[PDB]
Amino acid sequence: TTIVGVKFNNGVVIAADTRSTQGPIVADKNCAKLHRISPKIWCAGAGTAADTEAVTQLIGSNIELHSLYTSREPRVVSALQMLKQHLFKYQGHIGAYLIVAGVDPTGSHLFSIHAHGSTDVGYYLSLGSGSLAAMAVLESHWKQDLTKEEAIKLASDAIQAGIWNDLGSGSNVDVCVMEIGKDAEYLRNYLTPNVREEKQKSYKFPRGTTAVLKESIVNICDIQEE
Template identity: 75%
Template sequence: MPGLNFDNFMRNRYLSAKGFATPTATATGTTIVGCRFDGGVVIAADTRATAGDIVADKNCEKLHRISPNIWCAGAGTAADCEFVTQLISSTLELHALSTERKPRVVTCLTLLKQHLFKYQGHIGAYLIVAGVDPTGPRLFSIHAHGSTDVGYYLSLGSGSMAAMAVLETGWKETLTKDEAMALCGDAIEAGIWNDLGSGSNVDMCVMEVDKPAVLYRNVRTPNQREQKEQSYKFKRGTTAILKEDIKTLVKVVEFDEFEESLLKDADQMQVDA
């Protein structure tokens, strides 16, 4: 087996000397969490999608189905998370058909980490993969460079520090399903209230042994817009017109005149010929 290869380091240094700057990391905003309980696993995410300083979508879906018993939460670039999970979902389905067995969560983890490692972080997908298989409930996290973690509770995204504080405070080995859902909901809300890149609602997916996965869309809506105290629709004529000036920008030609001009042009062309 070959050892470490540093060809890319030499290439990057050569490109930097030629004026090609090394790409920097892109700041993204999301809070995603996962938590295991006795007999299953829960993942949750906020629903705010940002484009720089702009909220591009207030209710996007960050929980992705990979197989009937495996789901993942995605942070990072929305398109990268969407298409990477779709690619691995189809690959895992072919693998399951080939082996005639239900897919394992660790198989999904391996496919994802190998794919992301090939691109050295240029695919901006940070994922929490969770599911149940014949070995029981499993929970993993994958970073864009291909590194992975395993744990009983995990968080990723720009609001992960606030979420992890809640998870570390409230997690215990004897969590029930309802307690795990409440804990994940509280962790996501901590990210929503303490991170500008996270916001809107809370989505959740619960996977239990020998039961189908259940997606809870907008299970919490802490950012609902309140009713305005008064209407700001003004009646027509409220603002006075100080001056009115109408200018003709385009000459309107009737169809008969247009047809007549075409005939004249045709006759003139015949005369010239």
């Protein structure tokens, strides 16, 4: 999979593809790679799909618990530190790679966090399988200071190069734009590089084209007195 983050002035964007591969076979063509930590923190998953999914959930409940407890807005900053701690404890026996970014009152932040518990800050990051293919697009085409417009265009371009050169990155691009003091905009299937090709015959046939031996009703509900 491919995941990027592009820091811009008025917020930060996190984009990631929808396809999920577990072996050489595609598990899902469409399934979310933007998991919700808190209403203003989002993150995308790479690596082993099970480890990323579990972690995000585990940390997510804690940051919603924290919001209520500190009686103030959820920090990105809280989240990373807590998450880092969590990751450390397994000693790298959990295979989660994430890009976490968000807006909080300290501002926009864009972090990378590894399975080991190595932690990084940049103004442009990526992780995953297709990270080397996107990284090339960011370093060249990015400059410091951007509008909303340029950031969204640059984010979808990187995943798009991702799909075309990376095997495990495929299908559509889902983009989430978190601007400072505004709603996250979850734009499902912003970009399609290649739409579906159809099959050339109808494969639906009559019954008795598949053999039956017995026909039964199995219970699923409680009978009355009738």
